Amino acid sequence: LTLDKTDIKILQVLQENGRLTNVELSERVALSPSPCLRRLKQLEDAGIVRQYAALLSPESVNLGLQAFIRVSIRKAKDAREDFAASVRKWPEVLSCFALTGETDYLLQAFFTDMNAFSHFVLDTLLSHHGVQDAQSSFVLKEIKHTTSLPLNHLL
Amino acid sequence: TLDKTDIKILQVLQENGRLTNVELSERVALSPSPCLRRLKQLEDAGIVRQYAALLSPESVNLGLQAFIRVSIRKAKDAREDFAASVRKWPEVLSCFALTGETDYLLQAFFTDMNAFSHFVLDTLLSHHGVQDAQSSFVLKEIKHTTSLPLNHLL
Amino acid sequence: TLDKTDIKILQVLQENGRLTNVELSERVALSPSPCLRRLKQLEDAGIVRQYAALLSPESVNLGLQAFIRVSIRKAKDAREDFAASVRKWPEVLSCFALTGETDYLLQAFFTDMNAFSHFVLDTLLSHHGVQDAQSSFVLKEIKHTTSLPLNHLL
Amino acid sequence: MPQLTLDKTDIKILQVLQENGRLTNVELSERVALSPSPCLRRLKQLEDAGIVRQYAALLSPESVNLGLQAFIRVSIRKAKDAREDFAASVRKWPEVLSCFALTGETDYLLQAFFTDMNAFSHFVLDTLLSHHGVQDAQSSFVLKEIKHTTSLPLNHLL
Amino acid sequence: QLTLDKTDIKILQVLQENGRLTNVELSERVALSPSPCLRRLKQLEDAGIVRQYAALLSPESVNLGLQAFIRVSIRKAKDAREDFAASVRKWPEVLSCFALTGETDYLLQAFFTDMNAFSHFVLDTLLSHHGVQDAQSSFVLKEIKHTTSLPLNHLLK
Amino acid sequence: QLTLDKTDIKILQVLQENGRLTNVELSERVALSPSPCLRRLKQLEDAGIVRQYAALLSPESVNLGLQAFIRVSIRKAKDAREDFAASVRKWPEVLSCFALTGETDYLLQAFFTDMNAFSHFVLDTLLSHHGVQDAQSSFVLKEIKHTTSLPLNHLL
Amino acid sequence: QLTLDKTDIKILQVLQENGRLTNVELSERVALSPSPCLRRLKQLEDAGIVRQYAALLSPESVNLGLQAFIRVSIRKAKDAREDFAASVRKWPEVLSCFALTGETDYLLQAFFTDMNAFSHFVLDTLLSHHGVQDAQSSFVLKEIKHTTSLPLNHLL
Amino acid sequence: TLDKTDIKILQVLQENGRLTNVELSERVALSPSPCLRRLKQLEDAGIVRQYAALLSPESVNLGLQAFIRVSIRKAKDAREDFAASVRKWPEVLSCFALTGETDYLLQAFFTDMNAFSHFVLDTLLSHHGVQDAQSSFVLKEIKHTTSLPLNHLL
Ligand SMILES: CC(C)C[C@H](N)C(=O)O
Ligand SMILES: CC(C)C[C@H](N)C(=O)O
Ligand SMILES: CC(C)C[C@H](N)C(=O)O
Ligand SMILES: CC(C)C[C@H](N)C(=O)O
Ligand SMILES: CC(C)C[C@H](N)C(=O)O
Ligand SMILES: CC(C)C[C@H](N)C(=O)O
Ligand SMILES: CC(C)C[C@H](N)C(=O)O
Ligand SMILES: CC(C)C[C@H](N)C(=O)O
Ligand SMILES: [Ca+2]
Ligand SMILES: [Ca+2]
Ligand SMILES: [Ca+2]
Ligand SMILES: [Ca+2]
Ligand SMILES: [Ca+2]
Ligand SMILES: [Ca+2]
Ligand SMILES: [Ca+2]
Ligand SMILES: [Ca+2]
Ligand SMILES: [Ca+2]
Ligand SMILES: [Ca+2]
Ligand SMILES: [Ca+2]
């Protein structure tokens, strides 16, 4: 159905604390336990909540190097498919978007250090047949990073 | 200091963060009590910085996802005011000071191309520190996960 | 050769291509009998290539106006085939071979980024001649008129 | 929305008018399968409710000695109303037909016509660049017009 | 090799601007007897310094109102560089050509009547050539300065 | 305005290659008597067709074996584009200078003895100029073709 | 993995600056006994720390007036990265070669006599090589700083 | 004054800077006494500007080699202050004013990406003269020698 302010605040609270209890959740939305849990399921089935996940600290797991790699695919057949299917099998790459502009594709990957990166790029990214060109930048400082989408545009 | 079981939790949790101790204990092949101290222990540390509900963007009218490349003005204030402003802009999820010709990279979600129009013109570029902005748009999500790779710890 | 009076006709007609022979007789200080000949003499010659209804994009749900900067292959007939193709794509209104870094420039209209994505990925780039493309979108229309300047003719 | 108030014939009106904009209700109606009174009804509503914003004559640039079509990319300055004053001034330049605030490296893109490269030189050096807001300009020219129509596509409303 | 002095340099300075002075005139401007003056100038030619005497026309005056600078990029063959060079030599509208450093392989200086004329060249000749991978051209809005004259002061001690 | 006929142009073609001919020598190839042939070339040079006769020297022969094409950016100011234009005119090592379209504001053609002299130029004088915002220079590796001669077939 | 003692650093600081020193001279700079200076040093050399001792010459002194940096791009063909690598190793005019991140695939530092020398190298060697897709070179106008000495205070 | 022998001295010494005169005097086909005579004069002139020990970065924990393309502010003499500063930063081994888009180029070494970040953001960009910096990093070292070519002197 349509989301009303109640359905939003849930999403708002949950995008920030996705491991709450239905009890805690209700206590933060002015809802009764059962009526809360009903509305959350609706939201889940209707694709609105696509996954509950535990966000780790990159540094905590020795992942220092956060890479933004701008690749450029080949003008060949099934080059964009093979590439896509490949990038889906590389755990070091978390995200991947076909972008407007000079950049054909953009990858956000994590690595131990520059060595790890060098090995990745040289012996896997660039080895892929469909990769024609790669060009990568590194994060010096994380100004802001959240998974929480904006929701005021539904009020 | 992490160990093999300690880790296997993280892999499981990263993908299903809303598990029950009983369930998580099961997978990591632990008992609830010793499982729970570990999972806690890991949070105590900061290994897990948050559990979050991940939303479908289109599901919520946000169809337009932009990566903007901003270049900040060269002044002592410029970097901090801008930093403090971008933290207060909810349509922008991420922000990174990068290497290369791009000084700062912004990830943001918007309702449609018009919404973007008002954001950049009436907020982004209006900010005194913002000297120039240059933006691209996602045509296709090939892959998007939040789960870090962990095999380099084994 | 056009005289000051012919010039006034074309200027009036470029702005209201539906104007009556009478009001035209007025705006150009003439009689409707001769005045009509001047216009006929124009259409018939070839100064006036077309009269058109201009619609408002938003009005018909075309909120996304695109400018695509293509690069054609260095093929004997890549130039021909592509040109033939862009002629049949109703989403692309104009197409120019420019000077500079860009080989061709396309101005075209879409419903939304989705409609775009499908066009660029399944039709633009799928075309054999198209080597690479990079497009930018219209945040704001500061001015847009089909009327040419004519003061250089007096 | 355009599916709530528009039906087959209404969309055939706008297709036919976009290409032959200076007819008469009878002439047009004589081509959409209607009559000189009902056709007017639907027609007087399209241009009443914002659809048909203008009827215009389209001239041949070379015909009127305009043989140099230029696509200038301008970067505005980070003053304040730099963006206002520029916008206001672009509208006063007859040589500049269109002006758009685009995404990408370019801030604004102007489409303009001139007589010859001299005319253009004088325009850029003496006007575009002389304006206080214009920080930089870079311009390319049209070598060959592959396709140019003012008519929008409407098949997305069916 | 020759040894050039004040009086020989002046000869070259004077000639680089007035390539049509007589020997007499030239002899008075540099303060020499016509006879040895002449010898000198022939010596200066005989030494390879004076490559050519030419008349310089005003493009505008001969309806070549549009001057271009075309940054062309040559394909990767072996013969591409030579075929292209040898073809550019035969294009009269193309006056100069230079293999430059940086992102440009070759830079061309060419003159045309107008943009139609240019369009016709680029699309039907330059890009038609098998070696030309890509072209990217700009045009002269204003000629702030243009001289054939080399500087020679560095030679004076 | 002068109305150029088939012969007049020839006179320009032949001159553009050999600008030091004797009026007789010219008479003898243009198909004009020494009197008319003479008067015309004057009509031509007075009209503004023939703007000058110059000796063309060999760069390398005079130790100048480093040709530079500088792409410069001028600061947008009231006293900017003027001052720079006037300065470039008094810089002997810069032969030509063009305000061209595209990403470059100005293109400069300049000759130097070596990379060091260049260095001194750009650092101490080109970039020291207050109008000069940015400089980006390349160098000629090989001169495929260089002629002063304009084409004139378009007038036939 | 290292965490060298407060003077073991010093030895490598001094030796990076005066690499032909006599153990006696080395001792009077780090304030050790003349014997422990071949102990501390023995160890360091006997690891991988000191890769080599070289005489550094003055480029203009040997006529190499033209120091150039070349941004090369490999073909995304086959073993292009190998053949090229092995070839750059054989070109003595090319001192350094680094595979960088960014729009540039490879960066080369080289030295030449004058701009001509460079032209011959580029057209007749670099670009002739099968793997080299495009080259793009800038030159050094002025050397602000140049030392072979690595910073070591991060080990204290 | 720089004959064939003097070059065979320099070729040998650039590779083995700590070469025994006994050995050196052999590798050039000289007797010891006149060999020591030639090298001396070669360094008393300036040909041999320094003898130095070259270390292995990885060995000293400097994993990140990096090329920063600086751009100096066109101020009164930012050019001077910056130069004087860059000589005081030991992390930056070399700095060159190059032709092209790049005003200055710096070659510098660091421990890790964080060290780098600290330098750029708190030292490089904080200097008043620095208008912008863009930096690329060494993925792999195909070749690096301090020895110049000398065949051109034969
Ligand atoms: C798929 C991408 C390469 C599309 C391209 N960036 C464009 O703007 O059209
Ligand atoms: C802080 C940023 C301006 C850093 C810059 N993008 C770099 O390459 O180091
Ligand atoms: C209107 C402009 C300031 C827009 C900006 N250049 C962009 O890339 O989106
Ligand atoms: C048709 C295009 C490839 C022409 C090219 N952009 C030029 O400036 O010459
Ligand atoms: C005067 C110059 C700065 C003009 C500029 N190159 C342009 O194409 O608009
Ligand atoms: C060697 C190159 C292809 C590396 C690439 N330019 C990058 O930034 O990762
Ligand atoms: C002739 C060109 C291919 C030279 C190349 N642009 C360079 O900088 O070395
Ligand atoms: C010193 C630098 C600003 C010089 C500039 N890179 C040029 O090519 O002229
Ligand atoms: Ca692209
Ligand atoms: Ca979408
Ligand atoms: Ca930058
Ligand atoms: Ca809009
Ligand atoms: Ca191009
Ligand atoms: Ca034309
Ligand atoms: Ca911009
Ligand atoms: Ca002109
Ligand atoms: Ca090149
Ligand atoms: Ca030379
Ligand atoms: Ca490393």
Short mmCIF file of C-alpha atoms in Angstrom, two decimals, chain H residues 13 29 34 63 71 95 99 103 122 130:
data_model
loop_
_atom_site.label_atom_id
_atom_site.label_comp_id
_atom_site.label_asym_id
_atom_site.label_seq_id
_atom_site.Cartn_x
_atom_site.Cartn_y
_atom_site.Cartn_z
CA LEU H 13 81.73 4.36 -10.78
CA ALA H 29 93.02 -0.27 -18.05
CA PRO H 34 97.17 7.87 -12.93
CA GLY H 63 55.83 1.04 0.59
CA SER H 71 50.07 23.71 -9.16
CA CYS H 95 60.77 18.30 -7.34
CA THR H 99 56.27 21.78 -19.12
CA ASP H 103 53.43 23.33 -13.08
CA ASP H 122 48.18 19.05 6.59
CA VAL H 130 49.79 25.47 -3.24
#
